[PDB]
């Protein structure tokens, strides 16, 4: 278990500027964090087992991404993804 | 009570 | 990347669980988005939920109402204990 909540606080005022959140509130987004963050590198982890070499890259969160999130939010989730990884490589 | 984060 | 999320963060976190013996770089970049992606929609929902409500602040009943409402976001996250 990790905390987010900072980062998730900053996520909260961009998409909603004038809603805050309580404690008890928070501690059930930073609880989803964790547990989507556990289910994608497990399977990142199985998924790097196949490979000629033993690393988890992009390529292995992106099929984790795949397996483990329902197909509409999947699509939407590589999407962004993706985009990140092409502005950091640039 | 719940205070805010 | 063009995240809050924090990629250093994720990267040590990664790295500390053991997954695997390597972690390119690329990888806690895109996992960073995804989460961020991921919290976006629920407090996009939960924040609707609490203004619904009449309240300036999202409480736990507003992020239930959020997942329960949301067929993909339920089958995610589970059910929300209040």
Redo the contacts between chains.
Sequence with gaps: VETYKIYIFKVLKQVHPDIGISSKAMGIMNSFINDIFEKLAQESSKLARYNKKPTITSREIQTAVRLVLPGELAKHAVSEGTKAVTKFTS | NDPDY | ???????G??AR??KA?K?????????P????????????????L??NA??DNKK?????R??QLAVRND???S???GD?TI
């Design positions: 990347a063009g995240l809050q999320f924090p990629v963060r994720i976190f990664l669980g997954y695997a013996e390597r972690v390119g770089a690329g990888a970049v895109y996992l960073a988005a995804v989460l961020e992606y991921l919290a976006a929609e629920v407090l996009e939960a924040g609490a203004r300036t602040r999202i409480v736990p507003h992020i067929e993909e976001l089958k995610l996250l929300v």
